[model samples]
Target chain A: KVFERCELARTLKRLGMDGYRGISLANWMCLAKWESGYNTRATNYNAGDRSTDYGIFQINSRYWCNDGKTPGAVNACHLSCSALLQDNIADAVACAKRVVRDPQGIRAWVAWRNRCQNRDVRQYVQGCGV
Target chain B: KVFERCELARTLKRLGMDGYRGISLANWMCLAKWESGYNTRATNYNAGDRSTDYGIFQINSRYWCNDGKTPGAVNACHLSCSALLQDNIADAVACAKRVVRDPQGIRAWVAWRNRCQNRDVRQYVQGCGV
Candidate 1:
C-alpha cells in the first residue's frame, strides 16, 4: 500500500493533510518518509511495552485504535490499526489531526521533534506538484 | 485478546516480566493489571507530549521506541512499537527488560510507581496457583 513520493504528496494534498491539518506539505511528506517510507503496510513493535505501531502515520494499537485481537486497547481515535494500513489514508489523516490537536501538537510524532524540527524539510515535497 | 488479570499474572511470571527481570511478579502483574487489564492491545497518547504509549506497559514514544512517523525519535529500544501488541510477547519482554536495566529500573512505568508499590499482590496469583 506504499505510494510513490509524488503520488503520496498529491493524495495528501487532496486529502487536506498537506496544508489543512495545521502542518506544511513538507512536514507531512517528511513524516511519511521517516515513518512508513510511504509504505501503507508499515507496522512495528515496541521493545518495551510490546504495542504494535501501524500505518503511514504509525498509529499505536494501544491507545489510538483497536486491532481486534489486541484486547483492552484504548482506541482514542475510535478505529482499527489495520484500517490505517490500507492504501486509503483518509483515516490516517483523520486520526493524526486528533493527535496533533492534543496538547503536544505535532511533536506527538517525535520524528518531527527530534529530526525534522526547524530543519528545511521542503525537499520532501520539492517537486510533488501539490 | 484480553486475559483475566490473574491469567496475565501467571503468563507474566512465565514470561519473566516479574521478579526475575529486576522486578517482582507482583510488581509486573500489577503493572499489566492497571495499564491494560492483561489485554494485548493497549495504547495511549499523552496530551502534553503527544507521544503515543503502547501495550500493557504503556511505553512512551519520546525516549523509548519509534513510531517511524515521529521524526528524530530516540528509539532507544531499536524496535517498532507495534511488536508490543501481540499475545506472543517475547519481544516485549526483551525490550521491557532493557527499559528496566536502564537507570529507570521498574520506576520507568508510572503505573507501577504510582499504584503497584508496597503491596502484596500474591493474592492475584493466589487462586491461579502460579
Candidate 2:
C-alpha cells in the first residue's frame, strides 16, 4: 500500500513515532520518502551484500529481518521480513524503534544521512498537524 | 471472563508469552493464577500507592497503564488502562512484556516471587500442550 504524505504522517504520529528515541516525526517521514516513497511493498536487493531491503523503512534483511538467505543474519527484531510489508506498518514501526535502540541510531539507514539529515525536513510534516 | 486452566496456557503460549525475557510459561501461568485467577475483568486498588491493578495480569496503573487518577504516574505502555480489561488478552500481554523489559524483569510481579518463585510451577502448564 502507498500512503499519502499527510496520511502517513498522521498514522506514524498515532503510533507514537513522533519524538521516539529522540528522532523527530519529520525525520522519519523524510527517511520513508527517500527509502520507499511511502510504499509498503517496496523491496530492493543489494547484490554486493546479498541483502534485501524490505518494506516502507527499507529495513535490510542482513541485520534486522531474516530472509533466511542473508547468510548469518541476526534478526534482532525477531520478526519475518515480510511483516514489514504489511499495510498496517505497526511491525515495521516497532522494528524501526528496535533498530534505533542500537548504538548506530537512525544512521543505520544511509538514506536518513544523505536525504534527511541537516535537510529541510519540515516539508514532510508541514501541514500534517502532527 | 474467567479462562480455564489449559485454555489460558494455550492462549498465553499463542501470544508468545512462553519463555519471554527468560521467564517460562509455567511461571506466567502461576502468576496469573495468583494475581487474577484468570479473570479478565479483575481490578484491585492499592491504598498505599493509590494505584489500581487491572485485568488478568493485575498490571499497576502507577507505571504501566494510565487510569488518569494515579498521582505522578508515567504510562510507559502508552495504552489506556481500560484496554487491559477486555476479553482479548493481546494488549494485556503486550503491556506485561513491556513491564519485564525494565530493570526488574519478571520479579516486577510480587505474586511471582511469593507464589510462583521456586515453586513447582510446571503444574500450571501441565497437559496444556503449550
Candidate 3:
C-alpha cells in the first residue's frame, strides 16, 4: 500500500500537479480508505450500479466502461494502468475538484458522512472534516 | 486529410501491425465514411445515449470519457488526440477485431447493414463485403 501510494504520488507529480492540495489529499485518502482500504486489487461487485461506481475513483463503470475501451476491458487495462502509473494522485485530485465544482459533490459527501457516523465510522468523517 | 491518414498510418505502424487486415480496414473505412464522412470535426448530439457512439472510431464517449478524463472533458482531449494521431487506424482495427470476437458483433452489424441499405447506401455494404 505504501508503494502504491508512492507510485500514485509520482504519477501525480509527473502530470504537473501537487498530489496534496485543498481537500484533494483528504478526499483521495478518504475515498481510498473506504473503497479499497488501499488495496490495489480491490474489486467491488456493485460497481457501475447504484451500490458503487467504477474504477479506482468509483466512477460509474457505465461512464468509463461503455465501449470496448471500457476500464475493465482488455484494451482499457493498458490505458488505465498507464494512467494510474502516470499520475493517479493528480487524477484523483482533479476528479475530486470536478466533483466539488459540481452541485452533487458536497451533498453526496455530506450524506456519506452521515452514514459513516451512524456506522461508528465517525472518526473517518471527522478526518475528512465532513 | 491525406496528411492525417499518413500520420495515422505511421502511428499504426509503430504499434506493430499492418493498417489493412481482415475486416479491420473495411470496418474502419465503413464507419469513417458514415460517421465523419472522413471529416475530423464530426460531433454527434446523442452519442452517449445510444444514437451514435463516440470519438473518431465512434467509440461510445462515456467509456473513454469517465472521471475528469472523460473524452470531451479537458483531460480527455489530449489523450484522445494522442490516440487519434497515434495509431488511429490500428486502434480502430483493433476495436473492430474485438467486436468481431464478441457475441454481439454479427447481429449488430447485420442490423446496421440493413439500415445502410435502406438508406441507399447498399454500395457501402458491398464495399465491406457485409
Q: Write the per-residue lDDT of candidate 2 for residues A8-77, one digit (tens) a residue.
A: 9999997768898899999999999999999999999988989999999999988887677786576655
Cα lDDT of model 1 by residue, A39-122, tens digit: 566666654566877888788888898887554578889987888977788999899888877876788887668657899887
Ten contiguous residues with the weakest lDDT in model 2 chain A? A71-80
User: Which candidate ranks first by TM-score, i.e. highest?
Assistant: 2
Taken over the whole model, the C-alpha lDDT of each candidate is 0.73, 0.85, 0.38
Please rank every candidate by TM-score, starting with the best.
2, 1, 3
The alpha-carbon deviation from the true structure for residue B89 of candidate 3, after best TM-score superposition, in angstroms, is 13
Let me know the DockQ for model 1: 0.05
> Which stretches of candidate 3 lie above 4 Å from their native place?
A1-3, A13-21, A47-52, A62-97, A106-130, B1-130
How far residue A37's Cα lies from its native spot in candidate 3, in Å, is: 2.4
TM-score of 3: 0.33
True contacts kept of each: 0.08, 0.00, 0.00
lDDT, residue B116, candidate 1: 77
**Cand. 2 TM to true fold:** 0.54
User: What's the CA error at residue B71 for candidate 1, in Å?
Assistant: 25
- Candidate 2 C-alpha lDDT tens digits along B1-130: 5676788889999999998999899989988866765767656666688987888898999999999999989999998999998999999999999999988898999877987798887877778777
Name the TM-score of candidate 1.
0.49
